Amino acid sequence: PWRYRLDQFTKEEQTALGALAWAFYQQWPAKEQYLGLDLHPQAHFISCAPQAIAQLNDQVNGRIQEMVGILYGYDPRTEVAIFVIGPTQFKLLFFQPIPDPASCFAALGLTIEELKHRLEKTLQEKLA
Numbered sequence: 536p537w538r539y540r541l542d543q544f545t546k547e548e549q550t551a552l553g554a555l556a557w558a559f560y561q562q563w564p565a566k567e568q569y570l571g572l573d574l575h576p577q578a579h580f581i582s583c584a585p586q587a588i589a590q591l592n593d594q595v596n597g598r599i600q601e602m603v604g605i606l607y608g609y610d611p612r613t614e615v616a617i618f619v620i621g622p623t624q625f626k627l628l629f630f631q632p633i634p635d636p637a638s639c640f641a642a643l644g645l646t647i648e649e650l651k652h653r654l655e656k657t658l659q660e661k662l663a
Contacts, residue, residue: 544658548657551650553632560636563582589603615632
């Protein structure tokens with residue numbers, strides 16, 4: 536069950552996802568881009584524009600409206616919001632890591648590339 540696997544992935548890799556989210560927030564401080572995750576054909580992080588997400592919600596007739604609100608409204612300084620494109624539907628990873636995303640980035644010491652590379656391999660292994 537891919538949705539369940541993502542939920543466990545969020546808990547198991549809470550720190551690394553906090554670090555990746557913080558680095559992405561620094562690159563896009565005005566939330567011009569949302570951190571994305573496409574599972575097809577392989578799990579890899581992407582960048583989603585709010586226009587693209589709005590169009591995606593139009594294609595589904597408002598069924599991901601609450602994801603659009605959370606993406607608009609979430610606070611990157613404490614909250615992680617990752618948009619996941621699944622094979623059957625969309626999923627939003629929404630949580631507050633402990634410690635805060637900036638502290639996660641500081642504790643790990645990894646760059647954004649090493650964070651994506653480490654996390655994508657881990658997620659790909661869990662999905663199969």
